[PDB]
């Protein structure tokens, strides 16, 4: 009996298949989150600066109140 | 396992802005003067003439 190297292909490994595809981001939907984070960013920040004004006037009031200084 | 391994480079190098910035428009030679150098593999095969030895 002769024994040589046997042939096997099975699945053929798929000859040239695309793996690159669009994922997560679509296009217009990313701008809704992108610019949406900006509008949420300013509104949250400016409310803190209005709360800073409560401290600001109260800080300068200490100088006016102190005349024996 | 090879088909996924080679396709890992395309999602790494070809899709990126850097390669479309750097390698794009360097020595665009495809004319009869490009044929007057004789590259056989790539170049003429890569751009222009549909000739191949295979």
Measured CA distances, B1 to A12, A15, B7, B29 (Å): 11, 12, 11, 37
Give the residue on B whose Cα is nearest the Cα of A15: B3
**Does the CA dihedral A44-A50-A56-A61 come out positive or negative?**
negative
Distance in angstroms (rounded) separating the CA atoms of residues B3 and A14: 8
DSSP labels, chain B? -HHHHHHHHIIIIISSHHHHHHTTTS----SHHHHTT---SSTTTTSS------
Residue B3 has phi, psi (to 5 degrees) of -60, -35
Distance in angstroms (rounded) separating the CA atoms of residues B54 and B45: 11
Q: B49, B35 in Cβ contact below 8 A?
A: yes
Distance in angstroms (rounded) separating the CA atoms of residues A69 and B54: 97
Q: How far is B13 from chain A (nearest CA, A)?
A: 12
Residue with tokens 């990126």: B16
- Structure tokens that stand for A24 in this block: 């997560």
Closest by Cα among B10, B6, B18, B24 to A21: B10
Distance in angstroms (rounded) separating the CA atoms of residues A9 and A17: 17
Question: What technique determined this structure?
Answer: cryo-EM
**Does the CA dihedral A9-A13-A14-A16 come out positive or negative?**
negative
**Within the 1-54 window of chain B, which residues sit less than 8 Å (CB to CB) from chain A?**
2-4, 7-8, 10-11, 15
- Structure tokens that stand for B18 in this block: 């850097």
- Structure tokens that stand for B25 in this block: 């428009």
Closest partner residue to B2 (CB to CB) among A13, A18, A20 is: A13
DSSP labels, chain A? ----PPP--TTTT-SS-------S--SHHHHHHHHHHHHHHHHHHHHHHHHHHHHHHHHHHHHHH----
């Amino acid at each position: 009996x002769x024994x040589x190297x046997x042939x096997x292909x099975x699945x053929x490994x798929x000859x040239x298949x695309x793996x690159x595809x669009x994922x997560x981001x679509x296009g217009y939907s990313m701008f809704a989150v992108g610019i949406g984070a900006l509008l949420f960013g300013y509104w949250s920040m400016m409310k803190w600066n209005r709360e800073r004004r409560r401290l600001q006037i109260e800080d300068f009031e200490a100088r006016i109140a102190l005349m024996p200084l | 396992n090879f088909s996924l391994r080679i396709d890992e480079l395309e999602e790494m190098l070809t899709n990126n802005r850097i390669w479309r910035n750097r390698t794009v428009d360097i020595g665009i030679v495809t004319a009869e003067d490009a044929l007057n150098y004789g590259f056989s593999g790539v170049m003429l095969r890569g751009s222009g003439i549909q000739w191949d030895l295979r």
